Write a protein that holds these residues in place. Structure first.
Motif, PDB file in Angstrom:
ATOM      1  N   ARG A  66       1.055  -1.217  -0.040  1.00  0.00           N
ATOM      2  CA  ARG A  66       0.059  -0.239   0.008  1.00  0.00           C
ATOM      3  C   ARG A  66       0.813   1.256  -0.035  1.00  0.00           C
ATOM      4  O   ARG A  66       1.515   1.726   1.041  1.00  0.00           O
ATOM      5  CB  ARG A  66      -0.962   0.050   1.128  1.00  0.00           C
ATOM      6  N   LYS A  67       1.352   1.622  -1.268  1.00  0.00           N
ATOM      7  CA  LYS A  67       2.301   2.761  -1.404  1.00  0.00           C
ATOM      8  C   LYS A  67       1.531   4.003  -1.766  1.00  0.00           C
ATOM      9  O   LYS A  67       0.594   3.802  -2.906  1.00  0.00           O
ATOM     10  CB  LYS A  67       3.427   2.402  -1.957  1.00  0.00           C
ATOM     11  N   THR A  68       2.125   5.083  -1.856  1.00  0.00           N
ATOM     12  CA  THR A  68       1.715   6.387  -2.453  1.00  0.00           C
ATOM     13  C   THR A  68       2.409   6.271  -3.761  1.00  0.00           C
ATOM     14  O   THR A  68       3.157   5.490  -4.159  1.00  0.00           O
ATOM     15  CB  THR A  68       1.753   7.605  -1.586  1.00  0.00           C
ATOM     16  N   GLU A  69       2.333   7.489  -4.390  1.00  0.00           N
ATOM     17  CA  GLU A  69       2.961   7.728  -5.752  1.00  0.00           C
ATOM     18  C   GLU A  69       4.353   7.923  -5.685  1.00  0.00           C
ATOM     19  O   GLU A  69       5.017   7.519  -6.193  1.00  0.00           O
ATOM     20  CB  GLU A  69       2.089   8.772  -6.613  1.00  0.00           C
ATOM     21  N   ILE A  70       4.655   8.989  -4.653  1.00  0.00           N
ATOM     22  CA  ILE A  70       6.012   9.456  -4.370  1.00  0.00           C
ATOM     23  C   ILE A  70       6.798   8.229  -3.965  1.00  0.00           C
ATOM     24  O   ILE A  70       7.840   8.027  -4.406  1.00  0.00           O
ATOM     25  CB  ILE A  70       6.028  10.567  -3.544  1.00  0.00           C
TER      26      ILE A  70
ATOM     27  N   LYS B 153       6.751   5.088  -4.415  1.00  0.00           N
ATOM     28  CA  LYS B 153       7.093   4.080  -5.639  1.00  0.00           C
ATOM     29  C   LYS B 153       8.033   4.638  -6.608  1.00  0.00           C
ATOM     30  O   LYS B 153       9.010   3.726  -7.079  1.00  0.00           O
ATOM     31  CB  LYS B 153       5.830   3.604  -6.289  1.00  0.00           C
ATOM     32  N   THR B 154       7.975   5.828  -7.033  1.00  0.00           N
ATOM     33  CA  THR B 154       8.971   6.681  -7.802  1.00  0.00           C
ATOM     34  C   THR B 154      10.397   6.775  -7.253  1.00  0.00           C
ATOM     35  O   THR B 154      11.211   6.827  -8.195  1.00  0.00           O
ATOM     36  CB  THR B 154       8.293   7.911  -8.586  1.00  0.00           C
ATOM     37  N   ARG B 155      10.367   6.728  -5.952  1.00  0.00           N
ATOM     38  CA  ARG B 155      11.569   7.073  -5.509  1.00  0.00           C
ATOM     39  C   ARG B 155      12.131   5.838  -4.986  1.00  0.00           C
ATOM     40  O   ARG B 155      13.329   5.647  -5.417  1.00  0.00           O
ATOM     41  CB  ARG B 155      11.518   7.640  -3.954  1.00  0.00           C
TER      42      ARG B 155
END
Ligand SMILES: [Mg+2]
Ligand SMILES: [Mg+2]
Ligand SMILES: [Mg+2]
Ligand SMILES: [Mg+2]
Ligand SMILES: [Mg+2]
Ligand SMILES: [Mg+2]
Ligand SMILES: [Mg+2]
Ligand SMILES: [Mg+2]
Ligand SMILES: [Mg+2]
Ligand SMILES: [Mg+2]
Ligand SMILES: [Mg+2]
Ligand SMILES: [Mg+2]
Ligand SMILES: [Mg+2]
Ligand SMILES: [Mg+2]
Ligand SMILES: [Mg+2]
Ligand SMILES: [Mg+2]
Ligand SMILES: [Mg+2]
Ligand SMILES: [Mg+2]
Ligand SMILES: [Mg+2]
Ligand SMILES: [Mg+2]
Ligand SMILES: [Mg+2]
Ligand SMILES: [Mg+2]
Ligand SMILES: [Mg+2]
Ligand SMILES: [Mg+2]
Lengths: 51, 52, 102, 134
Positions: free
Chosen positions: A3-7, A9-11
């Motif tokens: 359960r991750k946010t957008e930031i 996962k991109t980092r």
RNA sequence: GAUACAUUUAGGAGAAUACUACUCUUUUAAGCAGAACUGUAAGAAUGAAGGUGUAUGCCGACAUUUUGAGGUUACUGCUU
RNA sequence: GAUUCCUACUGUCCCUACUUACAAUUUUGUGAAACCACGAGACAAGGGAACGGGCUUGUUAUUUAUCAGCGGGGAAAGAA
RNA sequence: UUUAACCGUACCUAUACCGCAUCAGGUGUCUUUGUAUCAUAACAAAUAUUUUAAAUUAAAGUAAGUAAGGGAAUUCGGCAAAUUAGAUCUGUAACUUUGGGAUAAAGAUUGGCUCUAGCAUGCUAGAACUUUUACUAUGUAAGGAAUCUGACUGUUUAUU
RNA sequence: GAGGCAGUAACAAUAUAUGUAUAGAUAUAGACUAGGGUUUUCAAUUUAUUGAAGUGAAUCGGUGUUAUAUAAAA
């Protein structure tokens, strides 16, 4: 934790890419004949601090 | 000696534990070439891999 | 080439060892006992059905007596060297049985 | 720990004296004791008869002595305890002291011959089979 | 210190043992017998306070006989 | 919660004895720390900064260079 | 019906978290089979891991057992251990804030098998026969008589 | 940078003459969230190293309302 946010996962994708040894096509050159990477990390030893 | 790949895959097909699977030492040659789920289902019907 | 039959009781051999390991000690004492009788010092090997019968009760308990047969065979490493193999023989009552030579 | 001695010595003198109790080996020492009386002298194969019995019997008990067997030679029988285990050399010599005190005679009524392994109730083998009736 | 002798090993057993040392040595272990410990084996027959109902048939804790029986050798001796 | 006395009960004691397991004693593998002015053998008395391992007069150990214990002393080690 | 946009969907629950570690510590919620005449405790299923020195023989330790005769004489002090205990039937005092004290204290009974008798139909009474006699594998209150102090249920110096 | 004490203290050490098996031994097991981030799967070389492949939503979570002038993954 699946359960991750957008930031987050991109980092996390970019931090996976930078942990790699030197490729073999570059090591045959005279510049990088015996040089090797020093900035590798281990996933159990040191933590990444992303939260 | 790809014995560990056969034990784990055959547990998923029958919904059973790893300790119940009995390999056959006579058919030693056929198990070293498994790669698919499909090849296992013929090995169960030939009674090379049976359940306890 | 002649074969033997002996009766060996393990309650006498394993008297007063630690009972946490009574079955496992009863194999090592069994190997040194036949090196005492047969003067030859090659090796002593055990068939699998004999090994399973000793562990029939568990580690703590060991059955009383056993009936055996002993022969000399060829080795699996060198053809010209030899080794000694032991095997289990089923018998119910042990009264009156003497050691014979086949 | 419990099974020990508490104090070894004082401060002065600053050494450990040879009179204190200290742990070490025990046994296999050499001793010498005096004044053992002689009761009977004879042979092992012969039968000994007294006055107060009717039966006559050998000296070896039923089933032999424990860890020994039977007696087939001459022997001596003396009073008390003797140094050492069974089957070991024992030296006998005359007495150094003189002016020993006079006592009276020795009258032996009977000698026991029961088995020394368990609680034995029979003297000879004929008493055992007359009891059970074969 | 004196008087004799020598340049003196291997494997097992215990009356000896923390590891060394010690006292002895050419016979290992089955089976019988002597001597003991426990306290009456399995199977079989005959009974049983009763109960069912008909098949002289089923279900019964326990008792007696075979049985001072059966089992075991951190004691001696025989035999192949 | 603090204190005293009756009944039962018991190795707390008179006075200790026996059995088993795990560490210890024996072998292989991985393989540290506190501490260290010099320590090359140990004592009796003397004087001395008035309690010496070394100074002064006396009495004395020694297995081919060990192994396992023990807590008298090193006014034993920790913390300006 | 070329109608229903954007982001996360692998894997680990403790040898894949936090304690400098492959640490006997700590961490939110739920589900889980069979015997078990109150339960508890205990055992078995299911599922997951795992390879090779010696031994009837030391002393002194850390745990667990047993003890003839005496029964607290040991000790600052019965500190440690031991005795009692489940269930059914009789029986129950001084004192009192009249509710309690009280499950007070003190006695007796308990297995197995074959039946008889009630109605609520699986529970309870009684009877005969038999034995090296019955809650006790696991679990399970020592009791009584006085004095000082606090009314009671409750809380507190994370680490003397 | 390298000594003595010292290879000393302290820890690890299941059976089989032929085996992808026959046995022994210890430990209840499985899912959502917080934390971890490729540890997942396969191939090659010896709880390691390198290289490929793998996460698909109109109805499963967020994105919505508010707790008397910035609040909910139960
Ligand atoms: Mg998270
Ligand atoms: Mg013993
Ligand atoms: Mg000596
Ligand atoms: Mg041990
Ligand atoms: Mg001095
Ligand atoms: Mg002075
Ligand atoms: Mg020493
Ligand atoms: Mg100061
Ligand atoms: Mg998914
Ligand atoms: Mg998933
Ligand atoms: Mg958790
Ligand atoms: Mg961590
Ligand atoms: Mg842990
Ligand atoms: Mg021992
Ligand atoms: Mg007593
Ligand atoms: Mg008594
Ligand atoms: Mg007193
Ligand atoms: Mg006193
Ligand atoms: Mg107490
Ligand atoms: Mg009755
Ligand atoms: Mg209060
Ligand atoms: Mg405190
Ligand atoms: Mg260890
Ligand atoms: Mg990888």
């Amino acid at each position: 934790g699946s359960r991750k946010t957008e930031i987050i996962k991109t980092r996390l994708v970019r931090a996976r890419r930078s942990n790699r040894a030197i490729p073999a096509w570059k090591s045959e050159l005279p510049e990088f004949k015996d040089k090797y990477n020093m900035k590798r990390r281990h996933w159990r030893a040191k933590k990444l601090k992303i939260y | 000696n790809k014995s560990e790949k056969a034990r784990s895959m055959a547990a998923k097909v029958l919904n059973c534990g790893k300790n119940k699977i009995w390999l056959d030492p006579s058919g030693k040659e056929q198990i070293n070439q498994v790669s698919t789920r499909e090849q296992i289902r013929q090995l169960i019907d030939d009674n090379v891999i049976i359940k306890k | 080439n002649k074969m033997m039959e002996i009766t060996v009781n393990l309650g006498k051999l394993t008297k007063g060892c630690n009972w946490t390991k009574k079955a496992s000690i009863a194999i090592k004492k069994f190997r040194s006992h036949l090196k005492k009788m047969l003067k030859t010092d090659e090796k002593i090997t055990i068939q699998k059905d004999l090994n399973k019968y000793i562990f029939s009760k568990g580690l703590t308990k060991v059955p009383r007596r056993v009936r055996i047969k002993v022969e000399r065979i060829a080795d699996k490493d060198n053809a010209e060297l030899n080794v000694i193999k032991c095997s289990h023989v089923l018998v119910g009552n042990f009264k009156g049985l003497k050691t014979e030579i086949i | 720990g419990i099974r020990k001695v508490a104090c070894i010595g004082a401060w002065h003198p600053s050494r450990v004296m040879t009179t204190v109790a200290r742990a070490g080996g025990k046994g296999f020492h050499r001793r010498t004791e005096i004044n053992k009386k002689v009761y009977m002298i004879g042979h092992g194969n012969e039968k000994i008869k007294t006055e107060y019995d009717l039966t006559k019997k050998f000296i070896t008990p039923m089933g032999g002595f424990p860890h020994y067997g039977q007696i087939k030679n001459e022997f001596i029988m003396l009073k008390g305890a003797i140094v050492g285990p069974s089957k070991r050399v024992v030296t006998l010599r005359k007495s150094l002291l003189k002016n020993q005190k006079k006592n009276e005679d020795l009258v032996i009524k009977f000698v026991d011959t029961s088995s020394k392994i368990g609680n034995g109730r029979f003297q000879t083998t004929e008493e055992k089979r007359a009891f059970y009736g074969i």
